[PDB]
Amino acid sequence: HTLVWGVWVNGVDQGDGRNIYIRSPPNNNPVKNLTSPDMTCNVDNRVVPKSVPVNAGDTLTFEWYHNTRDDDIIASSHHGPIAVYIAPAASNGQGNVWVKLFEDAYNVTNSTWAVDRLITAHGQHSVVVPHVAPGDYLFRAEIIALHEADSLYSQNPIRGAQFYISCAQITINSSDDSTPLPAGVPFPGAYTDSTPGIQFNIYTTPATSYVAPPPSVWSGALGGSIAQVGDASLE
Ligand SMILES: OC[C@H]1O[C@@H](O[C@H]2[C@H](O)[C@@H](O)[C@H](O[C@H]3[C@H](O)[C@@H](O)[C@H](O[C@H]4[C@H](O)[C@@H](O)[C@H](O)O[C@@H]4CO)O[C@@H]3CO)O[C@@H]2CO)[C@H](O)[C@@H](O)[C@@H]1O
Ligand SMILES: *[C@@H]1O[C@H](CO)[C@@H](O)[C@H](O)[C@H]1NC(C)=O
Ligand SMILES: [Cl-]
Ligand SMILES: [Cu+2]
């Protein structure tokens, strides 16, 4: 159970973005229905007044929270992967538009799921802004908690993979446009009950056998990472 407070740009806090540059839902309840319009940008998808200015090669850091900013972030039972997608604000989420810029599941060395590391990072994970056409974009961050993903929602409505999904409005000002944005996948639509990574037993199966949902990460991505970049408590 978790939501996004706002973003930092190159380590600089852009202030509370809720309902201002983030399309925030009314609360932190998960999304579970794979076919629902809520898979796009959660239950409350609508243009909000503002958009964060960035340039290609900026580091955009999303800050998640549970109840208050910089609290325990997400419950420690909610093991799973984290992903970030981009689409043009043009689409409004609809059609085959979403492109993956980041995926992180289980790191075998430290033996931590991406969600564990996000808790350590005080709710902060980042992506480098790719060299797409200047303009207005939605960045959709998704945490998949798998603590009940042994069943499917469509067969057992009280269980299933849980998606904590949030969309940020971002304006990309300076960019050479060396990597124009391709078409990508629809949400709802890219995740179905058959798709790998959706049904999985984190209690019986080992985390190394986990295989995150498709699609794979666009080659035009410049990466990202899970790690604190600023301190919220100095504010
Ligand atoms: O851990 C192994 C076990 O997990 C079982 O699932 C548990 C979760 O482990 C547990 O974390 C979860 O807790 C939820 C709780 O159900 C919600 O009601 C609560 O919602 C709050 C929210 O936290 C607040 O921010 C908001 O303001 O109010 C709402 C409503 O009160 O959120 C917590 C997590 O933060 O409960 C699950 C039970 O369904 C699995 O079922 C089991 O298979 C695993 O073995
Ligand atoms: C899931 O969402 C779809 C599309 O809106 C809806 O029609 C369907 O009834 C929902 N499923 C359940 C189990 O509520
Ligand atoms: Cl839960
Ligand atoms: Cu939860």
Cα 84 from chain centre? 4
Binding-site residue numbers for (1,4-beta-D-glucosyl)n are 9, 47-48, 58, 67, 129, 140
Q: How far is the CA of 218 from the centre of ligand 4 (A)?
A: 29
Task: Please name the residues in contact with 109: beta carbons below 8 A apart, sequence gap of 6 or more.
Answer: none
Q: What is the resolution of this structure in A?
A: 2.0
Q: How far does residue 182's CA lie from ligand 3's centre (Å)?
A: 35
Tell how many helices (H) and how many strands (E) occur in the chain.
2, 12
Q: Which amino acid is at 215?
A: P
Question: Quick one: which of 167, 168, 235, 159 has its CA closest to 193?
Answer: 159
Q: What is the CATH classification number for the domain harbouring 100?
A: 2.70.50.70
Q: Which residue lies with its CA nearest to atom 5 of ligand 2? A: 36
Contact predicate 13/62, CB 8 Å = no
Q: How far apart are CA 197 and CA 203, in angstroms?
A: 14
Which residue range(s) make up the domain with 139? 2-235
> Which amino acid makes up residue 217?
V
For the chain, the domain total comes to 1
- By DSSP bridging, strand 124-128 and strand 59-65 are antiparallel
DSSP 51-64: -EEE-TT-EEEEEE
Closest to 149 measured CA to CA, from 183, 198, 102, 110: 198
29, 146, 148: residue to mutate for ligand 1 pocket, most atoms within 8 A of CB:
148
Determine the atom of ligand 1 nearest the C-alpha atom of 2. 25
Calpha distance 48→20 (Å, rounded): 6
- The answer to whether the peptide bond before residue 188 is cis (omega within 30 degrees of 0) is yes
Phi and psi based region of residue 116 (left: phi greater than 0; alpha: psi -120 to 50; beta: remaining): alpha
Q: Which atom of ligand 1 is nearest to the CA of 67?
A: 25
For the Cβ of 142 lying below 6 angstroms from any atom of ligand 1, the answer is no
Give the tokens for residue 184.
């990508």
Q: For ligand 2, is residue 173 a contact (CB within 6 Å)?
A: no
Contact 198, 152 (CB under 8 A): yes
Atom of ligand 2 nearest to the CA of 154: 13
| CB half-sphere exposure, 175, CA atoms < 13 A | 23
Which of 35, 42, 152 gets mutated to test ligand 2 (max ligand atoms within 8 A of its CB)? 35
Sign of dihedral through CA atoms 229, 68, 6, 100?
positive
Q: Tell me which amino acid residue 147 is.
A: H
The DSSP annotation for 129-179 comes to PP---SEEEEEEEEEEE-TTTTS-TTT-TT-S-EEEEEEEEEEE-S----S
